[PDB]
Amino acid sequence: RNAFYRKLQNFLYNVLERPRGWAFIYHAYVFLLVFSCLVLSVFSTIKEYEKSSEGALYILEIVTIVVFGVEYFVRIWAAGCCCRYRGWRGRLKFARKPFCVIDIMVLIASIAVLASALRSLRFLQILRMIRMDRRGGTWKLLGSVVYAHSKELVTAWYIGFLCLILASFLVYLAEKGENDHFDTYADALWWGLITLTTIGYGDKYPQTWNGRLLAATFTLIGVSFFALPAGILGSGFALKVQEQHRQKHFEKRRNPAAGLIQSAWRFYATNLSRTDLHSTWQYYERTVGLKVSIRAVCVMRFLVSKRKFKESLRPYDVMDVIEQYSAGHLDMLSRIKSLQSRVDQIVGRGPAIT
Template sequence: MAMDPSRPPKERVYLLLDGRHRESWLSLGTNLFIMALIVLNVATFIAGTVSWIGARYGQLFAAFDVFAVGVFTVEYLLRVWSCTVDERYSSPIRGRIRFMLSPYALIDLIAIFPFYLPIVLGEQGAERMLRIFRLFRLLKIARYSNSLTLITNVFRRKSEELLITVLVMSIWLVFVSSLMYYVERAAQPEVFSSIPAAIWWGIVTLTTVGYGDVVPVTPVGRALGATVALLGIALFALPAGIVASGFVEELERRRQGPQYCPHCGEEVDDLIDEPPKSHVHDELEQKQ
């Protein structure tokens, strides 16, 4: 389906960049192009860290990076310009500021901003930051991927349970690390020099990673360490179970399709989990 040319330019740009408007070949092609550009841009960055590849194709990779940043910059500016079509961001100034502070818009900005830092900080001051922040461009693909959107929804819906679990884990970590500090500090004053130093042992033990760089040597310390390791298996399995159940619920929700309130027409999940979403996409679709 082609996009209706009678629409105002701002609406056409909005729908062109909207990943949900997949009925239009132009919108679908645009989103696939940006996705491919993101993947290639990150791939060239990773390949460039290999010495012989970087020496041979460094200039080509740099030119491609300039091209990619140019596309991402135009995309970001067009999104900011056209966001007022969405009723959530309808205010010309406040709406655009609100849109620019949304998670996806911040990711888009982080993906391109370091490229322009040399203008402000100079080449040497911005070079390292530029290299690191190029990896953030990979996060842009979440906007165009249903799989990553599913993951985002799972963590959003299970955020309260995960937050409680993280809080319990943090309390337990500080407790056992403090206990181990007092048990082992006399035998290993350099290793267990402070509670923050013991927290590293607690993280490695509770996660059952076991690097072996910090270990208890006293009988009481070893008994405590064994107990903490066994409890860590159960404690750190809780977030995995919560996320797994969230995936099952989200997949089941997608199979059943959206549930709508008979009174207001809003999606039931949206009314429960978050503020009402804009219907601009559906309204624009109905105009076709």
């Protein structure tokens, strides 16, 4: 079982950890559990139905704390998947993660109330869904795009601010007395923001057609300006994902290059005189004529990996025309090298016939 012991720990934790296949299946579903738990937590917030609300909601609360307490422990052991952490030191060392500690804090509070907590109970389920991330790559991705677009965004934000301030103030002095709505500058600022975002509550508006003629321009500007940063950041994502697709072809290229050099040093360490190079010999003797056989084993695996890295990059539009460039150019070079050979034999028979 120990073979399966480490197999399941490693592979199933990599699923549990950063996955690539179908780990989001489990993760989206446990998401659904805790999230729907939250929803029915709000379902208790309907007095007409809150009774049955709690009636099933405490059911779901039991389910939730069970799910994430066991997730705590099982992620612990499955983290035996990690080479650098195996046993006492490693897993009694890595537990001091802030994500982990807030995990156990909220979870022990969960079992405590699972041993009038409605509000903070909402907060802890909140922290569960927050726990979905573990990496902040959301914020990382965002701030990247933002800083990438910093001067554009500041442009929009500034000019929109000015339209808001100006037009609001103007109409405040446009319907100062004809409407109880617009009676303080605080009033108008509420109106300006509620308007320029195209929300349109309706609880205020101008009636003096002069004031209406004020808004009936500054709206045309501001509302679009407020609509910009959504549109900008939306594209900004789109552009980023396209170009990253292209580069993705290269990282595919990179891993075969990424491994061939491994076999390269695996070749160099194979000298019988290089007993100081005990790295691969101990790797083999631990994975254990035959030793020179093992030399040929690793070194020949290096040679085959050599052609492997030769195919590390397959295509890419500019790199693909790099390759077709390679075709015509290198075929030419083959031909020129031939002509080199021709001139070389002629240089040899220069003395041969003289």
